């Protein structure tokens, strides 16, 4: 089996593109992220997704955006895609002014909290550090 993907719409694709962080977070600007946000916008446009781009959100605006989006009616949508571009740490994304738990963001769309997405795939694409380890590679 495979998911029903022929609902009248493919679904939303929320792109959260955080580039400019407050200096008190200790985080540097994320050069090139704008190239990412434009690449995703066009790619998901071609998969027929309703793309909503958001830029430079605080941790507060992120949680209030995810809350709001999870209370929309997804009945006529096949799927949900969410793209988080930002600094990070293991289990943690960064609003422009501090960190958010990833579990907090995704839990709004849990089977029992977002009923019009129940049974429908929910993709979360995360471009963020998950630590400070470096992969030294090996020759082949």
């Amino acid at each position: 089996n495979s998911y029903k993907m022929d609902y009248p719409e493919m679904g939303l694709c929320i792109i959260i593109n955080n580039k400019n962080f407050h200096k008190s977070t200790g985080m540097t600007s994320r050069s090139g992220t704008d190239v990412d946000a434009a690449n995703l916008r066009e790619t998901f446009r071609n998969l027929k997704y309703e793309v909503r781009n958001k830029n430079d959100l605080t941790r507060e605006e992120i949680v209030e955006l995810m809350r709001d989006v999870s209370k929309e009616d997804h009945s006529k949508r096949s799927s949900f895609v969410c793209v988080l571009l930002s600094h990070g740490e293991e289990g943690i994304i960064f609003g422009t002014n501090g960190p958010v738990d990833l579990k907090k963001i995704t839990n709004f769309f849990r089977g029992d909290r977002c009923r019009s997405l129940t049974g429908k795939p929910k993709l979360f694409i995360i471009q963020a550090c998950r630590g400070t380890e470096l992969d030294c590679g090996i020759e082949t």
Binding site: D36, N39, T43, P121, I125, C129, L134
Partner: protein, 92 residues
Amino acid sequence: HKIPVEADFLYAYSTAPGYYSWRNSKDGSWFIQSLCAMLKQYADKLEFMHILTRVNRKVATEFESFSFDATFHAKKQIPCIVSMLTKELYFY
């Protein structure tokens, strides 16, 4: 009857757990570069998981950090697919 409330999520991380994720200041992040590329040619012929695997080879094989700091030079990266999905996903 019932499905698990955590079922039917797929988290596509740019990098392995514990590790940095690299981003090139002009071309974008390695991960999103390759994800967008791999969707452009395969979303019409391939199931999502197989596209992400393709994304994994691109990030693993074609990118390699360059840095004047030897601590950050010649570093690699592998993305990390976390699938709690119950069915195959085709964009067509």
